[PDB]
Amino acid sequence: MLGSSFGIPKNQTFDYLVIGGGTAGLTIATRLAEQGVGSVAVIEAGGFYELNNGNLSQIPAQDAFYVGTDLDDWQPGIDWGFHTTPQAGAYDRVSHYARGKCLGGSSARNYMAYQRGTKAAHQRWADTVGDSSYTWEQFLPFFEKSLHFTPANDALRGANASVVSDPSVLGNGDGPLSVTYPHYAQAFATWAKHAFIEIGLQIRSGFQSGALLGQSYGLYTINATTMHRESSETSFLRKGLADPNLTVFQSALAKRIRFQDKRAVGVDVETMGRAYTLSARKEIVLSAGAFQSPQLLMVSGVGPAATLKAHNIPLVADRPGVGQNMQDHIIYAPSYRVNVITQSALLNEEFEAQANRDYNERAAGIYANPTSDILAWEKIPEPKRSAWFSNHTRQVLAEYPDDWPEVEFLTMGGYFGYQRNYIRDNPSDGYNYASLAVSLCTPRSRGNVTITSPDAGVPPVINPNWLTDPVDVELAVAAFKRTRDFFNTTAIKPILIGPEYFPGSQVATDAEILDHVRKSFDTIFHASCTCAMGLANDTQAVVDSKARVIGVEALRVVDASALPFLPPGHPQSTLYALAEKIACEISGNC
Amino acid sequence: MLGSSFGIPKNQTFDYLVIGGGTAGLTIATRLAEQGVGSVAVIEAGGFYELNNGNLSQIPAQDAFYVGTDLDDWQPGIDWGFHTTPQAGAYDRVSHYARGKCLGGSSARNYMAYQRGTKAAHQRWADTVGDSSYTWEQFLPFFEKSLHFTPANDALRGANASVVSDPSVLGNGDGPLSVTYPHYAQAFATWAKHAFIEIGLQIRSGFQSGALLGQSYGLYTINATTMHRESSETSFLRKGLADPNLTVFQSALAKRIRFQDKRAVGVDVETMGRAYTLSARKEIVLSAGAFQSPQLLMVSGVGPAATLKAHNIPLVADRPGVGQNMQDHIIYAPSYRVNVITQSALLNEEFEAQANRDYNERAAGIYANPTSDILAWEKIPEPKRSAWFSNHTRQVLAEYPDDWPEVEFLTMGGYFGYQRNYIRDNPSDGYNYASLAVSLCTPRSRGNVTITSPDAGVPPVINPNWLTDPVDVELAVAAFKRTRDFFNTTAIKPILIGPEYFPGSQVATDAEILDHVRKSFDTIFHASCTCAMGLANDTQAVVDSKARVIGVEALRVVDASALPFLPPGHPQSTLYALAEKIACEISGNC
Ligand SMILES: Cc1cc2nc3c(=O)[nH]c(=O)nc-3n(C[C@H](O)[C@H](O)[C@H](O)COP(=O)(O)OP(=O)(O)OC[C@H]3O[C@@H](n4cnc5c(N)ncnc54)[C@H](O)[C@@H]3O)c2cc1C
Ligand SMILES: Cc1cc2nc3c(=O)[nH]c(=O)nc-3n(C[C@H](O)[C@H](O)[C@H](O)COP(=O)(O)OP(=O)(O)OC[C@H]3O[C@@H](n4cnc5c(N)ncnc54)[C@H](O)[C@@H]3O)c2cc1C
Ligand SMILES: *[C@@H]1O[C@H](CO)[C@@H](O[C@@H]2O[C@H](CO)[C@@H](O[C@H]3O[C@H](CO)[C@@H](O)[C@H](O)[C@@H]3O)[C@H](O)[C@H]2NC(C)=O)[C@H](O)[C@H]1NC(C)=O
Ligand SMILES: *[C@@H]1O[C@H](CO)[C@@H](O[C@@H]2O[C@H](CO)[C@@H](O[C@H]3O[C@H](CO)[C@@H](O)[C@H](O)[C@@H]3O)[C@H](O)[C@H]2NC(C)=O)[C@H](O)[C@H]1NC(C)=O
Ligand SMILES: *[C@@H]1O[C@H](CO)[C@@H](O)[C@H](O)[C@H]1NC(C)=O
Ligand SMILES: *[C@@H]1O[C@H](CO)[C@@H](O)[C@H](O)[C@H]1NC(C)=O
Ligand SMILES: *[C@@H]1O[C@H](CO)[C@@H](O)[C@H](O)[C@H]1NC(C)=O
Ligand SMILES: *[C@@H]1O[C@H](CO)[C@@H](O)[C@H](O)[C@H]1NC(C)=O
Ligand SMILES: *[C@@H]1O[C@H](CO)[C@@H](O)[C@H](O)[C@H]1NC(C)=O
Ligand SMILES: *[C@@H]1O[C@H](CO)[C@@H](O)[C@H](O)[C@H]1NC(C)=O
Ligand SMILES: *[C@@H]1O[C@H](CO)[C@@H](O)[C@H](O)[C@H]1NC(C)=O
Ligand SMILES: *[C@@H]1O[C@H](CO)[C@@H](O)[C@H](O)[C@H]1NC(C)=O
């Protein structure tokens, strides 16, 4: 009975509460319920994205809806409508920062890329938090536990789009999280493989074995049968319905964590104006993400003393790291008109109608593609390194491990432009558009989150502060010039129609390149480290290596906020794994 | 793809809009979508009751949750939290009036009784609205079209609980609305059959063939396989999700119908704070029910001129009938301790655990019962008639048709008391409690609905005004004495434990009985006739026989508000049928 899984908004007691039915939230809630620790309730402000955002969150190719910087490019059924402070690195631009408000959280909204960090990143993690269980070899089983891998389908993809994978690290098939290759590869990506080789990027066997340098076809959180998005909702929550130990509270806003002495004992909740308190006998897990986890700590009395005093919040623990040390990745892309099919073709009615039938009848065609296909990773090579970087920049980059890339390239079968609104500004003049996006994997810029109010119903103040460190500025210009090197290869030339479409060659000098990047970049949505994992004796750390909040009892944080630092690339794989790990830490029954 | 059925909250155009995803709403929306008239959108303020009220709305025996008169006996996931004005007939009591806020509306909340009115009621309907298609023989196919009848299961019910039905009027099996007999009959009802005969109520072949006088086992909107509630959501909406012509907007509040000249062209909607306008090319159907249909007309400029002026609403049509002539039924019941299992046994943990397993594993046991089982109908008999009624009362009752009953009796395997809150005040002292409820089928009292604001987000002012006509007062006392006659039968005596438990024999005189009824009665939730069907030339009528709103174009009302008068007994059968009829009227493709 479906309804048996869903809670009634009144005072009651569970063994465990998880705040936030997002990526980490639904994973840890489902695993705790299955691991015999007693009753678990998960509290989520949103509903099902299948009811609240049409089929836009279910179709991989529709992932560009409601992610633009424009303040109005969102709707309240899937997005919080959060905007940044005026951004020092983006000419004081106030931008929309997309966050999932739904069961699945930002796993309902992401571009579905599944890629793990490097052995050396895991080594740095182990060192920073003083726990060797975070080293690659000890952590890997938690990465594998979640997965149901399906190999590439060569018949639907075409021979051109053959993949190089490492199945030995993609689990035993028993996990609920579908990971596979899309049934459709962008024709652009097929050409990009040759261009990547010409600029010195060797093919490797996927991005799941603890190394990145080189190129490969990406793996995605997509169901191999339906080519629907795989979120934490379609994977973990669907398994957890059927577990009588799991209760879901949806359309439910957590307002305050309650403390008796320094012990977390319950959560104040509002469901459609009805206030109630859920009590926890054992532990509360905060999984509200990089913006709202720190906000809930602060309005509950855990955070910087001066902030809590200024908003009349009684102090429970002076923890100055709460909302500090925010890390993020950025993305921007030039675009060309190309002589191959890209997502542009969906603007043509006769083409869309065929793609629509291919998707629903055969799980095939361009709708079955998340826009991306091939990722590539490098250090900026010599001799460009000495020309493009100051001595200070080269000294800072030499402190990163050899395996830790500086720049990520992503094939995109669509137009980025200024990323104001990808749907409105999608060029409609009858050409196919493709982009080569770049992301920077060594961000030095640090941001923060604070509050204007003790009410969690008021949005937090979000200041990512991207592109403010001189190292990020120099890297941003270098990455842009590498996209120009990609587009000047003889391998890619035959599909290009005329010169660079966006921005165009008139963007030439270092200062013009920087100015264009400052106008055309956005976050790639990897906000993290606002409840950073570190040593219990570090006054800036928020959680220890067991994800316990320092200064209080029976409270953990398990989400992107808990990361000690942002590892290179796409973090969802790591958040699934971290949730798997802290579930076993709590239960002891794995 | 589920999401393909659900709308995005932005400006867009459909051929038809239905306001209110309730009993009538989801029926007409689904049928219009199937009948080739183009695109249909349904707008509903609530969500799925399966997500928003646990399993309480899915289990028939849990129908007593959130229906009490106490102002706090509701939660915002299934109920509007409406209260009445101070009630002239109930010692100025301000009472909660349960209304479904969910897909299915009040079909999510009702006691699931399926019973039709009388041939003579249908004759009066035809005469009042000037349309012979409302006579029994012409209207019957619209009653049958909806249904999937399953016969009584004698093996699960027991031989004691054999039924007398007329399958020839219960359709061909093709309709989505499950109607059947419960898998479990209250032991109390089994005894009640003999007691009903002793006080002169003969067995008849069900309540679906245009006659009521006598007794029979009731038919219910329950799925025959699962013994889950059958709402308009589990029947019509579930069929309509496969129809690409149907779009659902849930968590969507309609604020205003828009008029160009006198033509309805769109609806102003708010979904979680996001305002948008849905446009209608052809017709708008208002299905917001007896309280909110008249409210939406008035805030849109259709209603009594003086009311709209007083709240700064521009006048579109002076229609003084809007919100007037409200009709309703009431219910109250004495109770006895009884020597048989009733719903009381669910307070015993060992009994509940077995009933829980019986329900989920075999669709059997007391959870598979809607509380009622046998209905009985009469005129107050002679010689009690001359003793209990004034000459004026007898003159008014003689104007009703011979087939139209004055009093309904309902077996109830539970305690009513003052109906403040059935769950809190459920006696827990170890006895089984049963009640014999009565409802009055000839209400003379008339109520109304008005507004305090042009904002549909502000609740309407709801004044049922029950028990204010001297005919209803005399009938209320007579009905109560007939419950005493039932409980003094020699047939029922052997299961009674001690004397009348509630109110008790100390309630003796006519004035004491009236006083007790005024304290212990509530609505039985049949609010209707606030957008009454009549002749186009009647200034008090709101809709014509085609359900078109008089004085404007392209606007219909199809719900309990549209009834010309309240027919005897349970109206959901008539609302399904009326929705079937106006669907065919609109489409011309049946
Ligand atoms: C557009 C986009 C693209 C991305 N692409 C990728 C990608 O391709 N690969 C990848 O690895 N990562 C990607 N990411 C990032 C990755 O998805 C996120 O880092 C991850 O989803 C965050 O997980 P989380 O559990 O930390 O938070 P979330 O998944 O955001 O979960 C937080 C949850 O808590 C709820 N919540 C917050 N406050 C409250 C409250 N008070 N009460 C109740 N509920 C509350 C929210 O509604 C939400 O459901 C992308 C992000 C976005 C936005
Ligand atoms: C507790 C209870 C027991 C009952 N028992 C029985 C019984 O056993 N048998 C029987 O025959 N009848 C019974 N009834 C009555 C029967 O269920 C109702 O008369 C019938 O459901 C009314 O249907 P409707 O479409 O007129 O209104 P509803 O089904 O109430 O539909 C109105 C819908 O419109 C929505 N809405 C209102 N305003 C807006 C707006 N502005 N924007 C968007 N959506 C809006 C509401 O949320 C609701 O879903 C019972 C009623 C109740 C409350
Ligand atoms: C309607 O919803 C209720 C859940 O909200 C449900 O109550 C729950 O019933 C489950 C059994 O399915 C109980 O869970 C049990 O879990 C372990 C199994 O590993 C048992 O050993 C325990 O005894 C425990 O009872 C929950 O205790 C119970 N929860 C609540 C809130 O009471 C009802 O069962 C549902 N009703 C029906 C008829 O299905
Ligand atoms: C994602 O959701 C969209 C609708 O919510 C859906 O678009 C809709 O698709 C249907 C076809 O499935 C169109 O309805 C058609 O119905 C009749 C058949 O009797 C046809 O003759 C008509 O031409 C009509 O097209 C709707 O027009 C269309 N709605 C809109 C707004 O376009 C998408 O198809 C869904 N996406 C996928 C990939 O399935
Ligand atoms: C619910 O819990 C809170 C705090 O424990 C309390 O303020 C409130 O009164 C409770 N409500 C009820 C009905 O007990
Ligand atoms: C993929 O979807 C199909 C069809 O819905 C389902 O049978 C399967 O379980 C899903 N796979 C995973 C691994 O979730
Ligand atoms: C690969 O195949 C697709 C579709 O057949 C085609 O559009 C694309 O150009 C091909 N690529 C190469 C490199 O030949
Ligand atoms: C956030 O960072 C900005 C820029 O570095 C700084 O000036 C601001 O005060 C910080 N806010 C908090 C509350 O730490
Ligand atoms: C009753 O429920 C069963 C199982 O869910 C289903 O197969 C059947 O179609 C339902 N019947 C109706 C008419 O809703
Ligand atoms: C009918 O049978 C049931 C046994 O299931 C019993 O509880 C009930 O009293 C019986 N009624 C009569 C009148 O014999
Ligand atoms: C939406 O429709 C209304 C109705 O006229 C009007 O405010 C405006 O034209 C539309 N707004 C947008 C954002 O298109
Ligand atoms: C509604 O009914 C009452 C009688 O109970 C009457 O006094 C009142 O004026 C009516 N109000 C409206 C607005 O018709």
Short mmCIF file of N, CA and C in Angstrom, two decimals, chain A residues 52 101 162 235 269 271 279 307 336 357 403 489 497 524 549 569 577:
data_model
loop_
_atom_site.label_atom_id
_atom_site.label_comp_id
_atom_site.label_asym_id
_atom_site.label_seq_id
_atom_site.Cartn_x
_atom_site.Cartn_y
_atom_site.Cartn_z
N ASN A 52 5.57 17.29 -10.66
CA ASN A 52 5.73 18.74 -10.37
C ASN A 52 6.56 19.45 -11.43
N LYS A 101 14.32 21.13 -5.58
CA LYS A 101 13.32 21.09 -4.49
C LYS A 101 12.29 20.02 -4.88
N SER A 162 31.56 3.37 -30.19
CA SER A 162 32.12 2.31 -29.30
C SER A 162 32.81 2.98 -28.11
N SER A 235 15.81 5.33 -7.69
CA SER A 235 16.71 4.23 -7.25
C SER A 235 16.42 3.90 -5.78
N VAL A 269 9.00 20.97 12.19
CA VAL A 269 8.61 20.79 10.76
C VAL A 269 7.33 21.57 10.51
N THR A 271 4.41 21.38 7.41
CA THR A 271 3.77 20.80 6.19
C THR A 271 2.54 21.63 5.86
N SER A 279 10.46 13.59 16.76
CA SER A 279 11.48 13.26 17.78
C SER A 279 12.34 12.11 17.27
N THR A 307 27.14 35.82 14.20
CA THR A 307 25.96 35.70 13.29
C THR A 307 24.71 35.33 14.11
N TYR A 336 30.22 26.40 -32.14
CA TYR A 336 30.30 26.44 -33.61
C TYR A 336 28.98 25.93 -34.15
N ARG A 357 8.88 9.64 -30.79
CA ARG A 357 8.47 8.24 -31.03
C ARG A 357 9.64 7.30 -30.72
N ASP A 403 48.10 13.33 -10.42
CA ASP A 403 46.90 12.67 -11.00
C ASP A 403 45.70 13.65 -11.03
N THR A 489 41.93 21.95 -34.65
CA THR A 489 42.46 20.62 -35.08
C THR A 489 41.97 20.31 -36.50
N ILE A 497 31.11 24.72 -39.66
CA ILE A 497 30.50 25.62 -40.68
C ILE A 497 30.87 27.06 -40.34
N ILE A 524 28.77 25.11 -12.29
CA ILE A 524 28.37 23.79 -12.84
C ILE A 524 27.75 22.98 -11.72
N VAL A 549 28.67 16.09 13.83
CA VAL A 549 28.84 17.55 14.03
C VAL A 549 29.64 17.77 15.30
N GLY A 569 36.00 17.23 -10.58
CA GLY A 569 34.91 16.75 -11.45
C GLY A 569 33.59 16.64 -10.73
N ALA A 577 28.35 7.30 -2.40
CA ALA A 577 29.34 6.48 -1.68
C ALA A 577 29.43 6.93 -0.22
#
